[PDB]
Design a protein around this ligand. Sequence first.
Ligand SMILES: [Zn+2]
Ligand SMILES: [Zn+2]
Lengths: 280, 148, 56, 49, 98, 116, 258, 92, 213
Amino acid sequence: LPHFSKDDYSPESKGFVENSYLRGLTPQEFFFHAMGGREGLIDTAVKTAETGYIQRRLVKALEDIMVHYDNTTRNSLGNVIQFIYGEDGMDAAHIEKQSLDTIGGSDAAFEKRYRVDLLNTDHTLDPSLLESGSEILGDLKLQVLLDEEYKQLVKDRKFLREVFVDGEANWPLPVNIRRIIQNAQQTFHIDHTKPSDLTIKDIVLGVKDLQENLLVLRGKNEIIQNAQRDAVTLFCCLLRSRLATRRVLQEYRLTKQAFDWVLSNIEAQFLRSVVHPGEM
Amino acid sequence: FIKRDRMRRNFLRMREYNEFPLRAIPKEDLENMRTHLLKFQSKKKINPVTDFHLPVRLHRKRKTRQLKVLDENAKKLRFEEFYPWVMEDFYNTWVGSYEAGNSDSYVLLSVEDDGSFTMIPADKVYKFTARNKYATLTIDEAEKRMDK
Amino acid sequence: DGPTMREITETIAEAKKKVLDVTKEAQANLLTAKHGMTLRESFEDNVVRFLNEARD
Amino acid sequence: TTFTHCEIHPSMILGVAASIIPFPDHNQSPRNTYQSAMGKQAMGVFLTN
Amino acid sequence: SLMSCISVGTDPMPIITFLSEWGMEPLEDYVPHQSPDATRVFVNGVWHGVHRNPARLMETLRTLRRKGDINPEVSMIRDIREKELKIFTDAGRVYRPL
Amino acid sequence: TTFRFCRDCNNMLYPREDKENNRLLFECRTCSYVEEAGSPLVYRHELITNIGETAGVVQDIGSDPTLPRSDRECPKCHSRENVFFQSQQRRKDTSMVLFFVCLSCSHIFTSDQKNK
Amino acid sequence: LEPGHAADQEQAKLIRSAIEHTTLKSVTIASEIYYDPDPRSTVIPEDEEIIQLHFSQQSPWLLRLELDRAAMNDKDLTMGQVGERIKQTFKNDLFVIWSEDNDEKLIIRCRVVAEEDHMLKKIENTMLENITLRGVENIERVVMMKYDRKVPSPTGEYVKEPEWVLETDGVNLSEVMTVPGIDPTRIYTNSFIDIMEVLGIEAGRAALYKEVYNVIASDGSYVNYRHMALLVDVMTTQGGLTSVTRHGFNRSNTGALM
Amino acid sequence: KDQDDRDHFGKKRLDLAGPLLAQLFKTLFKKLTKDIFRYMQRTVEEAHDFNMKLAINAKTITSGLKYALATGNWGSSRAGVSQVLNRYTYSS
Amino acid sequence: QENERNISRLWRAFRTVKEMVKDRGYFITQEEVELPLEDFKAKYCDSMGRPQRKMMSFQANPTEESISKFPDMGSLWVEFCDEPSVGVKTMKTFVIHIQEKNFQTGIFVYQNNITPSAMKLVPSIPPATIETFNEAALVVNITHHELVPKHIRLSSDEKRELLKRYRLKESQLPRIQRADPVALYLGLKRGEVVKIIRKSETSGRYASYRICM
Ligand SMILES: [Zn+2]
Ligand SMILES: [Zn+2]
């Protein structure tokens, strides 16, 4: 602006503004502030008209892609786009960020939260937490079961350390387990400082059986069943991660009543959260 | 911090040397005669046509009704005089074109035999240019060659 | 607070200082843009940062 | 130094529409632009006759 | 703006006339090589000619406008940098008072 | 660059190597006129520029309205009034350094220090 | 970079040169064409010691041009290899004599075995124009940049490991991936088309995901992984990327009235 | 020197009503010049009687402007130049 | 130096190749694949320093298990070229060298290109087919990149199985193109379908299928 000499790059010349809307603007400043204020408006105007048009196009592209009654995603013609919808066949609305408590932290803490020992002593389960605990100590039919599952969670860690390569420990997932735990606690009053009435065999098997009933896919063909293992592959990895025996016993301290009502629920809500078919 | 107007109440209240004579040349000779001004572009110091070459030869080188466009006479006359003026030998050659920029306000002081002078208006000026001196011309000979 | 207005002005000041300082550094021919951007463009990022951060 | 002109008054860089905004120097420019459009369909009394 | 009007322009003849009688040598006679620093003089995009001392020339033009002799619509720019003097008498330009 | 023009033709004097004398001439490709080679150079490209950065400098330079001001002396006159501006090479990547001009003797002097 | 030589600055610098396009003209100062009648003794005084100490039949049109120290240092080079290139570029026909690294005046000249001066002009052009001196085509401003890469600590946690990253502008995916010292398994390109043609549709699709999820992430909002993942899997169903345009899918046999 | 900005406001001009009517008038005046000439040509070419009112069709202009105001059509070749005035409120 | 730069680039390319045919199914011991640069030099660089592409090419035979799933898979030869551009007559030796040996298919690895006419000589021995590769492209095993999920051929029988489990025609599958590298890396053919194990974040594992067009 001519009210200045040339080569004057000074902040106030090139268009700083160092008052604030309270104490008014000085002609040069005011003019300047018009400049940017318009620039937004132009941008707003176009950035809509590009958006409105753009968005319209994508509508016609993905115009009729539907989920047919096999959880596979093909246009009118039938050209299969996605073999399992969204790659895991869960509807959108029933997702929540939840935490993958097997992938963060150290092995040390990992063990510490998970590693249960009966023959030896190192991470000895304290028998008080449940009835059988006293005579459990040093048994063998069970100790193996620990070694079995605890192996698996590690095989879930190598698995997940890979899958997410940056150790992100939160993801969208179907049914929020966390609340299911809490509802339980606050519907049978986990009266702490007590032995519970759940056996190690109560825990692991009922879980095993649980996983077998999150039927995303209904077939019986080694094709269909394959996807099933690879549908819930993650959502299981969480579930086991949560319901590690120690955790359930040591912290959540469920009863029989709590535990079955829980599992029966996780089934139910999951089945809701299945992507519906016929949804465009 | 207000708006005040009646200050009309205030404002109406606050209110050696050598002579060399001249002569406008007789007019009859002008009436019969046309003279004009030569200019050259030779960049030669004087280029006196005396030392140019001889000889010198300077010269220019029933139905129904209809609509005629309209022009002023001097333009038609001068347009008609499109034949460029050419002085020759039979050896070098000179041609020029009209300039129309500086023919208006121009009177000449003929240094007569006397120290006096006469004043003579300017009719035309021309700009003769030497040409064909190194005599290369390829009218369509380099033209068709050009497209290469 | 009438006082904290003072400090705003101080923060305004340091900027201009932080702005004026930089400027001569370029005119002294004594500026290095790091590898990738010209003298002037680096001069810009040098400045405009100083302004936004000061305002902020 | 070498001033050769002084503005008559800077508030004379506004259109008809703008100089009806009070304190157009305290607002956020697009507001003004919005205001500019709006009076033109403010009702009033357009012409006394 | 409030304080804007438009040049409804005029004839440029009297203007040219002035510079003619005022040292604006005709163009045709321009010989640059020997007159390196002539200031070009334009009118309405018509480069009429050149000049050797524009400084006085300019101010003379100013007063001659401010006298009201030249019409005030006339806008005269002296690009001191480019030895170019520009002048416009055009109908359709936009100007304001200072 | 810096190439002569014919005489009595005034046309550009192109290089013509003399093979006999083992040297270069310069001719009017319009006429006969030719002339020898006075500088063993022929051409040059000179990609870089630090030329002209003082354009517009006139002994009438101060009369400009809007070059702002300072006080440094003439490195010759010791005359401490002068006016400044920036590199006339209004190229992109040019540096900022400021060109000053004495107003006693128009003495040019810039403001960079790394090389005078 | 190489995972061993990851966050290793020198290594980063060692590659840093290796890929940045370096044309001849990018660095040369000024070129003067000339006349030295003698094929042996150079007209200008100075170059002679560079003649004999090379000279310890030819054309006289002695082309001269100059390098800057700094940029010849910025892209650290020597002018032997340059000519060795230049010689191998043409032949052993153009006799190229280079001032040495010890020389303050980085000057290099040549001569050849109508008017030769004009080919030289053609000749000196290509030299400046199309002779890269090193670094891949189309690639300039090998811009360093430091990042954190959450590696697992040897303990079980992650830690924000710092490291050096080679930014760039231009894309020659093919060559760069083949450069020694880099890590090909993890090469990411701003434009995905290359990726497809270089790494096949499934990478491209995956790369396309990367490219979309950025845009939303840049903004700040979040959209379910479902949706973009669905869209991305439309375009690449026909095999090979597909625009979403007139020419994208209306060029598919997908119902007329649609 | 830099590339010219084509938007520096000084390089603009505002063809206000005056110059705009000129365009409209000037061209429309041609349509007069041609026509009389045409009729003039005919009457002689057939020795008819030279009458003025047939010779000049006045509508040629009056109809031209009145239309070309009434709609911003300006020939076609241009529109958006004439509006109804906006008498909402004084400032409008 | 540049020869030395070459040698690695050859060394790499060789190593890459081993893996290629290691993945169509053939029998190549892990260590063999992974001889360091040094051995490569002594084994195939001559005395002075040149490597012999002529005695560095070789034959392949599927692992028996490869044979097990696909009865057709036959021995396989691979060839490089010493000509930095490939004469027809030179590859005339090749195809008939195949024909004598009768590999079921065989794969050429030029360094720049071939006399165009010889590619006319290529699709010439049905059933036995030829695969041709820039040495240069083979420098980096694109498969090894992050974004290359696994792929596998299928027994037609498996592919046969698939549709009848989803009730599909071959046509409305998602596709790849024979042009696409991963095809070329696998040597795909019209209608060869590919299970693509993909490590997909919303289920950990997602698998897809394309049909080589
Ligand atoms: Zn000549
Ligand atoms: Zn001085």
